[PDB]
Write the structure tokens for this entry.
Amino acid sequence: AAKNAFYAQSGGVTAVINASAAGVIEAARKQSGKIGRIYAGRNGIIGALTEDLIDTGQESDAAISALRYTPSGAFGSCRYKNRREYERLIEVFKAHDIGYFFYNGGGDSADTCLKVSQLSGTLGYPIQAIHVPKTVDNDLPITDCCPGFGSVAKYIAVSTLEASFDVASMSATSTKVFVLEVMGRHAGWIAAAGGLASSPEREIPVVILFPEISFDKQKFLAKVDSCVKKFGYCSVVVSEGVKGDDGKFGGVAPVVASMVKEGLGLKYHWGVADYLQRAARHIASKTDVEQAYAMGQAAVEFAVQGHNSVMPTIERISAPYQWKVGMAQLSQVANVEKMMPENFITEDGFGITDLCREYLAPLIEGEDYPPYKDGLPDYVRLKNVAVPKKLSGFT
Amino acid sequence: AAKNAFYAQSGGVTAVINASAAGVIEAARKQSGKIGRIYAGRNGIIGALTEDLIDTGQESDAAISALRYTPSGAFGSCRYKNRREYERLIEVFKAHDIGYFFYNGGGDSADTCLKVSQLSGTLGYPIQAIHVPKTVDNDLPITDCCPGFGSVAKYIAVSTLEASFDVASMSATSTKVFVLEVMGRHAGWIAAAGGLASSPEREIPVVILFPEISFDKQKFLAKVDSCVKKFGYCSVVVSEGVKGDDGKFGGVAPVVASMVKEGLGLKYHWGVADYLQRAARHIASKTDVEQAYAMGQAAVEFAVQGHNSVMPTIERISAPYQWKVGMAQLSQVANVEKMMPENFITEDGFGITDLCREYLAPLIEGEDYPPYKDGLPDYVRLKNVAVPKKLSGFT
Ligand SMILES: [Br-]
């Protein structure tokens, strides 16, 4: 048998990870003959371990399609990254005749698929494990970009643009500096998106604090001051993972704001987007949405073609911007991240270069708005009907 | 001939105040014979004092029309509240034959507008003063609602909803509480918007901390705990003006978050919208945008009708929802705040009642998206041609 499929989400969720789920599920449903029942892990991989499976077959076609415009993880997710655990996974998949494992997550998920695939054969129950890319941090290697990043980038760009229009109108006699804290503990891709608020036809002062750059309060204040002098105001985009001469600097926005007041005496305003930036399906990138769905669909097609231990990718064929689906071996993804290029950050280290803009800009192109009802996005909530347990409990 | 008009934006800006500006300008242009030239003060009333006027007559029709989908104050705003200042305004208005004064702002602006009349009348200078309503706080009396609020409410409801979908999917083994800090120092209308994220078809735990309700940590933690037990997670919307016993409570989000980890040991996440909530034209309320424009158009119609010391209002005539333009006396608006009614808040003081929902829901109805270019809203920046000075300086 081994014709059933298992899909699970891992790590932090995004605004379009459900689009990837729809790609996987709709592609799998069109199969049948190859793929039997489609199960999902409640709350992720942990659902697999505790045998809390969801029968996605009980969701209507309309409900699955609605996943394409619904934020976060419709089946739940977790940050659970063990011989006993791996063996338990195989036992559960075996009990439910699962021969396919579609794991939708970041870098760590890639390694899991690799281990699941290799241990399954060793235990006499081979499973095709396919990694479906996801990460708002945009740190996966090989692929041109990661599903979820384009939408966060669009949100950050739009938000930075709007906050800049606001502070600008008030800068004459009131607030002159706005500080926005964004995600990106180690990578600066998110922060970089803030630079998109500025254009050649409409230049806007956007001082970016990247995690990759060592924070220099002196250079920073100097930059802000020069901006306030030239434009009358200044917007600051700061990553949560910025570190100074030491390490780390609880918000990072309140702290940066105080430095500006303390060293320049300028009135300020600050905000922390936190979860809003990664769940902003109301202003998602159409390009990102299409790519997220594509990756899910391709995972299934690759599995049916007989591939194993691979990850579909986004290949930038041309810059108009054109992309196609590619395929990477997980041995090339396991570990090794996509660090932000040094030539993507300006000489002063507070902005993005034209090279960076050329890369980022196409990723936020287009708007894909969810339908509305009574003033709000009509987001879907799946029935997520539980699957009867077959094994004894797991701790 | 005292036929020119003066328009100025005052106080904190909103996402649709430019919609009101457009209503005034396009309405004023169809006049002529009654109104000569339409000048705007650069940076509000300050512009009138330093004789830094803008001739909107030199703005293209396309740009004025674009104001309808552009956030913040396109002419710049300010927070400016002796006989010398009045004598200066009169000199400036006289020098430019200004007989109409349109002041677009909130409660404080209403008072300024009142003083520009009651005093200019006894001073013998024919000038009609008309207040154009604006305030994201929704605290102006008489009018059913204020231009700017509907859009902030839509933004808060959408954000709370998206943040709730996010926390819910991670709640199993991770973050269980999300705290969002919103605006509103004395009125809880903003915070109330958070309650629209939930409904009968899809109940969502949203504990709202209003400025009108005295904070009781014990009652709060109890409410949260009960939510986490029933749903598995909880969302908290807290106004920046919430006060406990000694009135108070680096912002309120981190503070409230701490109380949850302390008294309940629940993993949390928090954000602070700040400017984002009042410049979010990318997700403004269509109803709000139409009312904002209607108020600007009505102000001009009133001026041409010979009215003085008045403010156009929105009158709810039915609920489906139907409204019309009304006329209120500034003397009844000046220094009066429309706080949240006691019956709009639930018994435990942590939610909104059905009466509140009946009032709020219609205000966030409809989506009015601005046009986009290169992934971002194509917001307009007016040319704002200066008017050559005719008088001596003023400090
Ligand atoms: Br009158």
